[PDB]
Design a protein around this ligand. Structure first.
Ligand SMILES: [Mg+2]
Ligand SMILES: [Zn+2]
Ligand SMILES: [Zn+2]
Lengths: 83, 49, 1358, 99
DNA sequence: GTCCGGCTTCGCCCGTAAATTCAGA
DNA sequence: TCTGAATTTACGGGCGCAACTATGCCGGAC
RNA sequence: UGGCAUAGUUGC
């Protein structure tokens, strides 16, 4: 479980961008298609996303990079299947 | 308030000068109120209800 | 969807466009069949179908007919949602004047026609005629004709002539005005006028006319011809028990407007006589006025049960209106309520939620889990499973509650810690278990309190609860830096008992091998919890680069202290647990742990502190008995001495030596002194009560008495309540803040006989009335503070401003209250702090002053630091992070986005309300000081005086003749060690610049009287006085002398009102003795009720008290009486006797001395010489004919208006004045508020500025505009070659500042909804909803927290 | 007392008040100030739009919760439309102008 | 039972506009 | 006899939050 | 099946 998010806040030093980043990451894990990048410990998506932020393997830049890579891969797959 | 006649002051809260006016109200058990009031010029006025 | 709200007058064409059909019949429902009428208020062809996709007569009843209109009745088959938003209209038989614009005060119609309100009221309601197009007659335009005048005009001016009557006449006048032409004449007249009041009226008229011209409105639209009708569902008829429908209010008003309209139409159809139609028109006007705003005109029409009907204005305004009842605060789903219990076993991050409320709140989540796991395919099955409370849905509930925070909120959410998120733990019960530590934040005792649980639903909301609102993130209060989770009463008692020592207990003097050995000994029963021993303690110091370094030593400690040391984390020193550990000690311990180690260690430390304190308080068995309230043996003799004192003072009073007021004051002061002496004797006998020895001689020690052990530890109670328990309980105060001079001589252990238990009830009634009647003042003040400061949000990180305020330690007249450590902590410096020695940069320019920097300042002994303030920020629409400073909820700088305005308003408003509701915690005892009467210097040092004009009397004793004399005890290093306030007429033992030693008085006076000490010698003359009306003289025939009292303005006669009694010092020849080297007489004016004991023509000497004015009593000095001062300060009230300041510098000269109103003139060196001031001659003047004066210098004494300070001394002067004045009030009550909040409130006060020179900009001459707008316009102008417009900042009250805002929605939701809406409609205002209140009302993301990024992105993607 | 979903008032589509009728707790004005003091913008938005008086918003949020997705469509409160109509019932033309 | 309609005063405070009263020319 | 400033008088707005229980809800012609 | 009024009460 989780008690305090202090270290995650230090990793994203705004206390407000942390909320948005964690919400995006949890949404990507709840709809979700994607899978957690940290060993799941019977946690809910929000806690797992926050722990991923704590481990230093999620942030706004990483999420943007992964989203762009997924978009490019989807475009390439669509083009190959069509043309 | 018991019916009768009562004299009060409104002690200086009016006229912003500290002068204590004086009012006399005749409260009936069943009827109309009659008030005799003073003013800063010390002129006795009356008002009904 | 949209980004702004536009408001303007509704033209008849627009009203018709809104409506989908005219309402003609005044019937709602048949009352036999529940169908709507044909074309009544509740209609189907006008407002839409009653049922979804069903025709009225049932011809069509399916979606396949979605859009077609039945021909039998004419109802557009569609959903019923449209019926909620379909408006109607009524074609008024005659034009009707809209009441809002008639009685807005100011009246729009009244001053658009330049006609007074009484006359336009007379014309509108058919009591007088008004001429239209007078032409070549004996009539003017706006002139008024009564029935006689109208008859005379008709019989004498039967030619072309028009004098209409009623709303039609006003509409004709409005339509016959050329707005731009009128603007031209009014403006050219304004330039060609000379008066000032007429100037104000003319500029107001010009402003209204230009507002009309600029906006798309027209004057005649102010008179209603087509009346809109609200959609039926917003004025529903809901069946009551039985056939009777709900007695709706809007329906009655609409239905008695249709009645009059139909009657008038019928009368005009048959050409009824003029009188009858006139009366019908008047009744129609009254009905429409009642519908629009009932009771505004007078005679609020009342329905059945004689209750005034709620009109549309009444529905949108007030506390019960939409803004403050359905838009700023709403009822919410997924919310429950329940009583709260303790549940000590909980951690700080979790709360005990009952299984039943957990099941009821999380029903949709349980349904989702059931569907996901396949236990219920259809939602009906899942609902049935949940309602049966099967054994499997509980497992689902445990699985879904794991990491789902729940908000817990207590009813009076005074500050932001009144709503906090906790992880639920399912509890078998019906009450919420609330962690003991957070109770202090909630102000939640467990004596019947109830709290509400809310469930965040979305992922964003859950993460906000987990990362912003978790109780483990709110360790520090947002108002100050102090921790808020400090253990309250049981934990602190347990720790105080644990960490304590006695001269002889079991296992004393033995040497232990560590804390573990101490716990083993204590549990084994071989050593007492409090016994002096030696323990090998290993403490970790992290003075290295983040490396914890161990240090092992042999500490002289106790068993309990060693046991407690096992709970402290590593990095803390050992001395932190080597004291008695009261409540303040534990608070400091937690604070230091937070600052040194971090957040998680602090949370764990707090939890362990709570557990160990509870355990060892249970072990201690600390109880309370009746033999613990020991009565002092000195109480009776103190009482007897006080009674002798009151007897002798009464004897003096009956002899006339003293008057009633000063006798009452003296009695109060001596009783307060006796009460303080009794309390001191009680505490002396109580603290050292125990002397214990079994190994030799007696040794005194701090007592183990339960009452003292709880009072000293700070667990519960203070000196006052223990005093009332054991010592005499002192004076009481009546509800009106009046102190009952009769004391209570008995404590609570003793009787309190019938008479004493009758004086007490006065104080008890005061305490309970202030809780239930005077809490509205604190709530109103905090609402005003929030609504003036809500859009202020941190936007930038640094504006690069070099301006700031000089923070210095505060010494109001005693010792240091708030040292420089606490006034500059967590605020960014403005300029480099040079070392006190020689020009060495001690701290850089833009460094945040955290704990280490403050300690560096302390050890280097700095006396004043210039820091960046919120009020001196160069940021437009917000505050940069640097000027604000430390967050005060976390240890870092304020994050970019956090809303500091709401935080400041809550911080300033919460303590007032909390203390108002806590006033009843001391019964009703009056909080009193000894009234001083002397100044005892405590430490050696030089003595200096500021703002002092003293004189030497006959006995060589220096006497202060100045009002604001400050006596500063300076140290040999030049640092002001102490400060004191020397009243006007005090005798100084020493002088200026003279050395003193501690414990010796340097000043003494009489606090109960204000003397009138002179400046020179001579004889006394009662000038400009007449016996009988100017003074009341009392004759002392037996002695032969006489006395007299000046009778104030209230008592003196109206005839000869202006007679000024004065004491004029004259020489033997009979001429005024001029004061040293001046040109005015030495005459001293006597204020009202001044006791003169002299006789005319009596010799006197310099420094002698001619007369003494009784100083009048000051009642109980608690929050209830001091909060009004704060409200006046934040409202910027002009004092009743403002001190007159010098607008400009230069030389001073008195002019004509016209009529007893002496003229002052300040001639600068080379500037504007002819500046002049009108000063009444009856008030004193500090500056006379000889000397220089800087602008903002005091010409006379008295309270200083903040407006004058802003105009003359500047923004920093006024903000410092406000901060100090409010902080005095909040220090008197022991309230700790950081100055950041007051500074931001002051900023929000001074947010407008008036132009003085238009410059090269496009502003008007003397208009008031937002300071930010003018500043940015000037910045843009100076960017080019033009020159910006010079401005003058204004100070506005919080109410006026909030109401005078660019957005009309924020002001409308605030007070004066009618006036704000009327002004916005007339001016055609447009709101960008860029604040917080507007976004709350509209229902979109707040531009403060996580929504700040969204709003910034939207602005970029505009 | 506890409520997840229940009957809503008529004039404004907000939860009913009290526990005799299956009502919801009032998120008062001071509670809104407290949430503004935090950075809790999404919590507040769902508190006063999706949980109180957004008929489409609350229905969609309920369906999403049942579907296992915790996301909301903000929408506009119905009480704001009520206020707009009440102001329009006077001679005042208040409108939400286009973007 | 079913259908139709227009006698209460009595609080404390403050801001602002209108009316009055000075105080002159 | 007029005219501006300051003073007085009249009058409109404000008067904390949350919660629970009960009763009563229109009077007069066909 | 939801509204207003009055009375009482609880926590501040
Ligand atoms: Mg309580
Ligand atoms: Zn039909
Ligand atoms: Zn700044």
């Amino acid at each position: 479980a989780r008690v305090t998010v202090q270290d995650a806040v230090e990793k994203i030093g705004n206390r407000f961008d942390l909320v948005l980043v964690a919400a995006r990451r949890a949404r990507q894990m709840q709809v979700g298609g994607k899978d957690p990048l940290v060993p799941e410990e019977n946690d809910k998506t929000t806690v797992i996303a926050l722990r991923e932020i704590e481990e230093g393997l999620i942030n706004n830049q990483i999420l943007d990079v992964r989203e762009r890579q997924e978009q490019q891969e989807q475009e390439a797959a669509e083009l190959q299947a069509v043309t | 308030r018991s019916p009768g006649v009562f004299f009060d002051s409104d002690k200086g809260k009016t006229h912003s000068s500290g002068k204590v006016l004086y009012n006399a109200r005749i409260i009936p058990y069943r009827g109309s109120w009659l008030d005799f009031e003073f003013d800063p010029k010390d002129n006795l006025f009356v008002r009904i209800d | 969807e949209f980004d702004a709200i536009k408001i303007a007058l509704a033209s008849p064409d627009m009203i018709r466009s809104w409506s989908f059909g005219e309402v003609k019949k005044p019937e709602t429902i048949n009352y036999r069949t529940f169908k709507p009428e044909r074309d009544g208020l509740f209609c189907a062809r006008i407002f839409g179908p009653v049922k979804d996709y069903e025709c009225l007569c049932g011809k069509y009843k399916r979606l396949k007919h979605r859009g077609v209109i039945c021909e039998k009745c004419g109802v557009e088959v569609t959903q019923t949602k449209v019926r909620r938003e379909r408006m109607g209209h009524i074609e008024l038989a005659s034009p009707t004047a809209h009441i809002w614009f008639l009685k807005s005060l100011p009246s729009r119609i009244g001053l658009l026609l330049d006609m007074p309100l009484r006359d336009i009221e007379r014309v509108l309601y058919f009591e007088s005629y008004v001429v239209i197009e007078g032409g070549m007659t004996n009539l003017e335009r706006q002139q008024i004709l009564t029935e006689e005048q109208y008859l005379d005009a008709l019989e004498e001016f039967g030619d072309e002539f028009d004098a209409k009557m009623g709303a039609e006449a006003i509409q004709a006048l409005l339509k016959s005005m050329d707005l731009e032409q009128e603007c031209e004449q009014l403006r050219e007249e304004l330039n060609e006028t000379n008066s000032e009041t007429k100037r104000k009226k003319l500029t107001k008229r010009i402003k209204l006319l230009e507002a009309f011209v600029q906006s798309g409105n027209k004057p005649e639209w102010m008179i209603l011809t087509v009346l809109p009708v609200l959609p039926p569902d917003l004025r529903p008829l809901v069946p009551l028990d039985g056939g009777r429908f709900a007695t709706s209010d809007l329906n009655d008003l609409y239905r008695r407007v249709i009645n009059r309209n139909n009657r008038l139409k019928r009368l005009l159809d048959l050409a009824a006589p003029d009188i009858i139609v006139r009366n019908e028109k008047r009744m129609l006007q009254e009905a429409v006025d009642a519908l629009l705003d009932n009771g505004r005109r007078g005679r609020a029409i009342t329905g059945s049960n004689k209750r005034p009907l709620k009109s549309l204005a009444d529905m949108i305004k007030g506390k019960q209106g939409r803004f403050r009842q359905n838009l700023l605060g709403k009822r919410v789903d997924y919310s429950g309520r329940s009583v709260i219990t303790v549940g000590p076993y909980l951690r700080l991050h979790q709360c005990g939620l009952p299984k039943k409320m957990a099941l009821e709140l999380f029903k949709p989540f349980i349904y989702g889990k059931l569907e996901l796991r396949g236990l219920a395919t259809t939602i009906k099955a899942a609902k049935k499973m949940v309602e049966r409370e099967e054994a499997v849905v509980w497992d689902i509930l445990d699985e879904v509650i794991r990491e789902h925070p729940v908000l817990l909120n207590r009813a009076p959410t005074l500050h932001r810690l009144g709503i906090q998120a906790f992880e639920p733990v399912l509890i078998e019960g019906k009450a919420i278990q609330l962690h003991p530590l957070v109770c202090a934040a909630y102000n939640a005792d467990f004596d019947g309190d109830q709290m509400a649980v809310h469930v965040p639903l979305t992922l964003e909301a859950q993460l906000e609860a987990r990362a912003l609102m978790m109780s483990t993130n709110n360790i520090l209060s947002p108002a100050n830096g102090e921790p808020i989770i400090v253990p309250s009463q049981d934990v602190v008692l347990g720790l105080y008992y644990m960490t304590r020592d006695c001269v002889n207990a079991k296992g004393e003097g033995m040497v232990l091998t560590g804390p573990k050995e101490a716990e083993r000994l204590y549990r084994s029963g071989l050593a007492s919890l409090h016994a002096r021993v030696k323990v090998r303690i290993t403490e970790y110091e992290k003075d290295a680069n983040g490396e914890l370094v161990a240090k092992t030593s042999l500490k002289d400690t106790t068993v309990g202290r060693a046991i407690l040391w096992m709970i402290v984390p590593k990095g803390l020193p050992y001395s932190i647990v080597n004291q008695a550990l009261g409540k303040k000690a534990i608070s400091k311990m937690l604070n230091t742990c937070y600052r040194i180690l971090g957040l998680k260690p602090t949370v764990i430390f707090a939890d362990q502190i709570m557990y160990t304190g509870f355990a060892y308080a249970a072990r201690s068995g600390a109880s309370v008995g009746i033999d613990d309230m020991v009565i002092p043996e000195k109480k009776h003799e103190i009482i007897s001495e006080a009674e002798a004192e009151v007897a002798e003072i009464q004897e003096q009073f009956q002899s006339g030596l003293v008057t009633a007021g000063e006798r009452y004051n003296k009695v109060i002061d001596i009783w307060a002194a006796a009460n303080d002496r009794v309390s001191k004797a009680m505490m002396d006998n109580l603290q050292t009560e125990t002397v214990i020895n079994r190994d030799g001689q007696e040794e005194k020690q701090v007592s183990f008495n339960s009452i003292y052990m709880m009072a000293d530890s700070g667990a519960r109670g203070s000196a006052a309540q223990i005093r009332q328990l054991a010592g005499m309980r002192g004076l009481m105060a009546k509800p009106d803040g009046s102190i009952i001079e009769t004391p209570i001589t008995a404590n609570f252990r003793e009787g309190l006989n019938v008479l004493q238990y009758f004086i007490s009830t006065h104080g008890a009634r005061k305490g309970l009335a202030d809780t239930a009647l005077k809490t509205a003042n604190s709530g109103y003040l905090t609402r005003r503070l929030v609504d003036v400061a809500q859009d202020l949000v941190v936007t930038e990180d640094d504006c690069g401003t070099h301006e700031g305020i000089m923070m210095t330690p505060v010494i109001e007249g005693g010792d240091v209250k708030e040292p420089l450590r606490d006034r500059v902590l967590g605020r960014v410096t403005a300029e480099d702090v040079l070392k006190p020695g020689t020009a060495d940069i001690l701290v850089p320019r833009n460094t945040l002053l955290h704990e280490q920097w403050c300690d560096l300042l302390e050890e280097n002994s700095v006396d004043a630091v210039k820091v960046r303030s919120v009020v001196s920020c160069d940021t437009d629409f917000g505050v940069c992070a640097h000027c604000y400073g430390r967050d005060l909820a976390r240890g870092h700088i304020i994050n970019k986005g956090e809303a500091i305005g709401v935080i400041a308003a809550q911080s300033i408003g919460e303590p007032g309300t909390q203390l108002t509701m806590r006033t009843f915690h001391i019964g009703g005892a009056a909080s009193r000081a000894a009234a001083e009467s002397s100044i005892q210097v405590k430490n050696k040092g030089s003595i200096k005086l500021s703002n002092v004009k003293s004189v030497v009397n006959s006995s060589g004793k220096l006497v202060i003749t100045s009002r604001n004399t400050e006596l500063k005890l300076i140290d040999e290093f030049g640092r002001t060690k102490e400060s004191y306030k020397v009243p006007y007429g005090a005798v100084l033992a020493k002088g200026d610049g003279e050395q003193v030693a501690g414990g010796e008085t340097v000043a003494n006076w009489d606090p109960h009287t204000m003397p009138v000490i002179t400046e020179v010698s001579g004889f006394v003359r009662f000038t400009d006085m007449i016996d009988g009306q100017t003074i009341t003289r009392q004759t002392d025939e037996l002695t032969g002398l006489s006395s007299l009292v000046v009778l104030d303005s209230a008592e003196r006669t109206a005839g000869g009102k202006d007679l000024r009694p004065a004491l004029k010092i004259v020489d033997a020849q009979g001429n005024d003795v001029l004061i040293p080297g001046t040109d005015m007489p030495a005459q001293y004016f006597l204020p009202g009720k001044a006791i003169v004991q002299l006789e005319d023509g009596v010799q006197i000497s310099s420094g002698d008290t001619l007369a003494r004015i009784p100083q009048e009593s000051g009642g109980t000095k608690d929050i209830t009486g001091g909060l009004p001062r704060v409200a006046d300060l934040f409202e910027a009230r002009r004092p009743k006797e403002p001190a007159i300041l010098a607008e400009i510098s230069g030389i001073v000269s008195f002019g004509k001395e016209t009529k007893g109103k002496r003229r002052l003139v300040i001639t600068p060196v080379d500037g504007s010489d002819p500046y002049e001031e009108m000063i009444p001659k009856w008030r004193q003047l500090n500056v006379f004919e000889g000397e220089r004066v800087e602008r903002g210098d005091v010409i006379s004494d008295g309270p200083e208006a903040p407006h004058d300070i802003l105009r003359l001394r500047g923004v920093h002067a006024v903000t410092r004045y406000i901060v100090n004045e409010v902080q005095d009030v909040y220090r008197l009550q022991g309230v700790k508020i950081n100055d950041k909040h007051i500074e931001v409130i002051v900023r929000q006060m001074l947010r407008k500025a008036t132009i003085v020179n238009a410059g090269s900009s496009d502003f008007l001459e003397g208009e008031q505009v937002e300071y930010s707008r003018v500043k940015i316009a000037n910045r843009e102008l100076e960017a080019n070659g033009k020159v910006g417009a010079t401005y003058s900042r204004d100070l506005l009250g919080i109410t006026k500042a909030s109401l005078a805002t660019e957005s009309f929605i924020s002001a409308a939701s605030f007070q004066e909804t009618t006036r704000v809406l009327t002004e916005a409609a007339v001016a055609g205002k447009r709101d960008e909803l860029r604040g917080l209140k507007e976004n709350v009302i509209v229902g979109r993301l707040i531009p403060a927290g996580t929504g700040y990024a969204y709003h910034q992105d939207r602005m970029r993607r505009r | 007392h506890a409520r997840s979903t229940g009957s809503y008032s008529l004039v404004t589509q907000q939860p009913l008040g009290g526990k005799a009728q299956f009502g919801g707790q009032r998120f008062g004005e001071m509670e809104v100030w407290a949430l503004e003091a935090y950075g809790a913008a999404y919590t507040l938005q769902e508190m006063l739009t999706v949980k109180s008086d957004d008929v489409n918003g609350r229905t969609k949020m309920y369906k999403n919760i049942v579907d296992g997705n915790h996301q909301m469509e903000p929408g506009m409160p119905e009480s704001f439309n009520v206020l707009l109509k009440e102001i329009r019932s006077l001679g005042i033309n208040i409108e939400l102008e286009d973007e």
